[PDB]
Amino acid sequence: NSIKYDFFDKIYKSKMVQKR
Amino acid sequence: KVWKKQRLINKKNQLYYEPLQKIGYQNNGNIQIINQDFKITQIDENSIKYDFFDKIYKSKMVQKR
Amino acid sequence: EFALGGRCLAFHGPLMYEAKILKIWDPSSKMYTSIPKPQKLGEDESIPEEIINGKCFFIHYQGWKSSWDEWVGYDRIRAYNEENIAMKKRLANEAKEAKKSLLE
């Protein structure tokens, strides 16, 4: 269970990026 | 709007099918967890988890942006 | 499909005979599970060597006497489903056609 982990880290970083 | 699940047919005429995208594939409730109209999707259970996750994400961003 | 006490349909030549399972064989442990069950191969119980190492089952043929109990493995014991019933009826009809050809 690592593909989900990295995908969600990327999506969360993008999410804070869009919500700075 | 009304939704119904398909009825039980003989497995002689049952046409099981499996998709390839495995992340986004719009299916009915006729799924299988692991005349060409009653195809039951073999859902690849982890795809259920994935589909749930980004669905909750979209339900968040509809009200977040 | 394949369980203790469950129905099964096993091949016998160009036709099939439906039976009920009584013992489930475990080739790894050299053991069968029966019902009125961890127990070794019986003193009078044995399986043919081509199915002693396979998933064999002790079945009783319905419509046949209790003396026709047979040890049949996964080779002939099919999965009891709609296809199994349709295919039993198909080979029954083919047997009927063979009989009619022998007659007419």
- HEC states along C42-77? CCCCCCCHHHHCCCCEEEEECCCCHHHCEEECCCCE
Q: Cβ of A4 under 8 Å from any chain B Cβ?
A: yes
Buried b (16+ CB within 10 A) or exposed e, C11-31: eeeeebbbbbbbbbbeeeeee
User: Which residues of chain B have a CB within 8 Å of the CB of A3?
Assistant: none
Distance CA C83, CA C63 (A): 22
Which of C22, C24, C23, C19 is CA-nearest to residue C88? C19
Size of interface B-C (CB pairs under 8 A): 9
Which of C82, C76, C72, C80 is CA-nearest to residue C52? C72
Q: Cβ of A20 under 8 Å from any chain B Cβ?
A: no
Distance CA C46, CA C24 (A): 13
DSSP state of C104: -
Which of C7, C1, C24 is CA-nearest to residue C72? C24
- Determination approach: cryo-EM
Size of interface A-B (CB pairs under 8 A): 7
**Does the distance separating the beta carbons of A11 and B64 come in below 8 Å?**
no
Structure tokens at C80: 């009891």
The gap between the terminal CA atoms of chain B, to the nearest Å, is 28
Resolution in Å equals: 4.0
Q: Cβ of B11 under 8 Å from any chain A Cβ?
A: no
Q: Cβ of C81 under 8 Å from any chain B Cβ?
A: yes
Distance CA C21, CA C72 (A): 10
Residue B25 contacts residue B19 (beta carbons within 8 Å): yes
User: Could you give the 3-state DSSP secondary structure of residue C28?
Assistant: coil
